[PDB]
Symmetry: D2
Subunit: 298 residues, 4 copies
């Protein structure tokens, strides 16, 4: 099973003029690796892929892969609506040394099932890298159903997992039973912090979730506890994880909130975010702080 | 009132290797102008803006505007999820000679109302061109409500209309009452063929709809009949427009169907569409042809 | 084709203690018959079926059929969630002299397709009367799709029409092509005022819509004009019908709005509605009046 | 805090002619009480309220309250669309000796917020019994949001809890923060088996869930372990609860499944269900059996 465990969707740190902030992104990467994460995911939703141009995304990916320098597995999010660009970004990720790509379904047009299968097959065929699918139906408007994901894993042996970002036990349970039932080493990762624990108990493989940026230790230690068979300890971590997503209501998009939390939790990076997101206002920053303090995270 | 009447969302004609087909796109543009349309809208949904890169979009807009050569007003669709790219595409449109830009709401993240207002304001402030809003909630997952549109038209004097793409009489009626009630010259255009007649009877201003590519005469003659007070004639065109959208069920996306209909209706252009769309298969092309024959369109 | 033309969903007039108001309901029935409607529909949504007990519904239907005294065809809405009660109400309708029953899908549980087909087949088999389906997905949360309605019409020869209450030209168009294409005399009636014209132009059969209560002459004259081939005149009535549904935004449920409009349009019936609906407040009644005045309806 | 802990939504056992099976319903009640449940809830969605007439529901409720004979607190489901009937059923519950009522929002019309509050205020005013609200937005089409529920708890001192049936950690979390934050003893209960453990860890109070019928011991022992501070033991029960809901996919409605499971788990009751539900077929009964065997439940 590839890409299991705790794999943060790393925030992309930008300077005040919206350029890649290399020292801050580097320091964040180093923080997370030192926290004991099982891999790093660049250019996910939290990484602001959808607010970035293709050349910017290539620059960020190359920078990130190079800085990680093989210390942990690296995933690059290469998806979007422009399928020709997805191939280009995916081939580029492979050339630059990524260990895998994560590919959402096209989220403007909700393409017919035949076009959607064809799309993922074509992307998968464009690289020799492992491909993780990315389901986020609240944003895409089109669910990657367990049956379809199983069909995609039957069709291409390099389609080897899914980040399933959805507040639904049922969807995770059914993703696991359907796809892992036919493909035992297919990887199932939840995209929300407060689903990590259930995803493990259900027989899935970990999480790619926002709190990996600012409190990776909670997920890392939950996974470690769980793997040690200390379920009670794991449940204790889960109890923090259950509360964390309160903070994501502070704004939409909440990429600003995540970066503000990285600062409050002890890593001073620029919190600039790209339009149409915007800076978090002071009242909400203090709110975020009180939440982090209540959870003993800063 | 700016940009009223029948303004097709012009198909972008591509060669087999996916490049701008300049002779074919020119020929289509000339066809529509000589059919009597009131304006031309490039790089809408039907123009495949979301499957194109930014440089590609710039080249297509420049070519298109240049070929129209001021014979009719030209709109350029500049929207996306990358707000910095929206500004750059909009400023480019303006420098390239466009008459207006058409801006959809960001369709990945459904940004908070505050961010959404700020986004459109920023875009409007980046140009001195008129700005048309674009509502397509089936695709975007976020409705531009009549109240929100009113608030945008109240905030910025260059936000002067909307393409409201929705199968909903209520939405069109409410957009008209709420926005045109406060701003008599704000332009309301429907984005669907079969809502043109109702839009006119409701006090709105016309349509930007797919059949403008392959049967502009139906909409052009409907509008003329309407303005002439020949309601019965208008209704007869309406009856054809009511039936046309059957064909869009043949695939999703249906940009392929639109281009196949351009060919069937007398204009031999390449029908290549960009991934993740795909060629219409021969059985469905034959269906399409039967429909178009039944409607007396070819 | 059975039950075509203009068939109002008649308001049930109650006294202040919530009992059936026989003189008010009789006077309303007689007004509608005198206006030239083609049938009358009791205990639809606008008749408050879902706020009434079964014995009250039986009393209402009995009274209504008896007062109509075969002057026009009579439909009784017999639907709900309690399927045994639907059979009872539908058998009672038949015994009481109704010309047909209107049956919505169960709207609590959204029952599986097999359960749904079996439900309708069992209801249809409990009576020898014609059965009109009723689709109101905004309220039911489960659409009767054209394919499913075709399947029901293919299964039972007494399932002979549908009231399709949905603000969607596509749904109406497709209901007509799919069902009427297989069953030319299957009846298609829209449930919204502003879709009657389009329904007629699309090849469907008329409307069962709230304004039949207070302005039946609009729909009646529209249908007559249409049948006479005077399309311009029909479109002129359509223009009024396009504007009427503004008033339904005044409250939810808007049964109160409809009875307040019957009064304002010149028939003084009691406007009591059953909980959880409530009386329309005076400022909104005055807005209603202004509306009706602007439309030349009172 | 009232009605905390494990409170099954009890199946109503019917004979083959669809009458109340008193010996079977009595035996099931006695099994649940013996299993250590903290209360019993009759005529919830699982008790088939929506397929029963009012007099039927009165007779069931009276039978049930009588048979419980005050051994544990008894809740009666008195909701529906007929608001006058809700008051009648609720006053009847009170007279018959119930300890509280559980009241869903009206689920045909989605009544305005003003009408909704008024509805719940009027039912709460009709009885001196504690009222539990019942949120089931997948069926009702109208969410009882934490803000609204807080407004209801501020308005009436006998509105003292909620059954929150939704597959959503966020909703449960926010219900708890918002309502219990203002009303510490307001009761929050989840309606799904696989949310019990999270509900407890979030600060809620228990569950009313389907598996309380055929495996009450899992929930009872999870609650006991949690209250004992034996989190690891609670998590082990949770793991069973995570898997149980697979069986509810077997049919819709799945009231048949729950009753088949009561049989398989050792209590021979008639499994008859009311239309429009229908008997579970043998293949699916066997599937249920294999699931229950895998979970060590039969």
């Amino acid at each position: 099973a590839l890409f299991t465990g705790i794999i943060p969707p790393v925030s992309t740190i930008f300077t005040a003029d919206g350029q890649l902030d290399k020292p801050g992104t580097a320091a964040l990467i180093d923080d997370l690796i030192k926290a004991g994460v099982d891999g790093l995911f660049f250019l996910g939703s939290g990484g602001e892929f959808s607010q970035l141009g293709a050349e910017e995304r290539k620059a960020i990916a190359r920078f990130a892969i190079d800085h990680v320098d093989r210390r942990v597995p690296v995933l690059i999010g290469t998806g979007g609506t422009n399928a020709r660009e997805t191939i280009e970004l995916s081939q580029h990720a492979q050339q630059a040394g990524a260990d895998g790509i994560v590919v959402i379904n096209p989220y403007y047009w909700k393409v017919s099932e035949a076009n959607l299968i064809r799309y993922f097959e074509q992307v998968a065929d464009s690289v020799t890298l492992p491909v993780m699918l990315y389901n986020f139906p609240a944003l895409t408007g089109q669910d990657l159903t367990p049956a379809l994901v199983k069909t995609l894993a039957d069709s291409r042996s390099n389609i080897i997992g899914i980040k399933d970002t959805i507040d639904s036990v049922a969807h995770l349970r059914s993703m696991i039973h359907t796809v892992k039932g036919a493909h035992p080493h297919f990887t199932v990762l939840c995209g929300y912090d407060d689903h990590l624990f259930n995803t493990l108990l259900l027989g899935g493989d970990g999480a790619i979730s926002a709190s990996g940026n600012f409190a990776p230790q909670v997920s890392v230690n939950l996974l470690k506890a769980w793997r040690d068979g200390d379920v009670a300890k794991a449940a204790g971590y889960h109890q923090t994880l259950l509360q964390i997503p309160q903070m994501y209501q502070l704004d939409t998009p909440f990429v600003n909130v995540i970066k503000e939390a990285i600062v409050l939790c002890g890593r001073p990076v620029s919190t600039h975010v790209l339009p149409p997101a915007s800076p978090l206002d002071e009242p909400r920053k203090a709110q975020l702080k009180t939440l982090l303090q209540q959870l003993k995270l800063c």
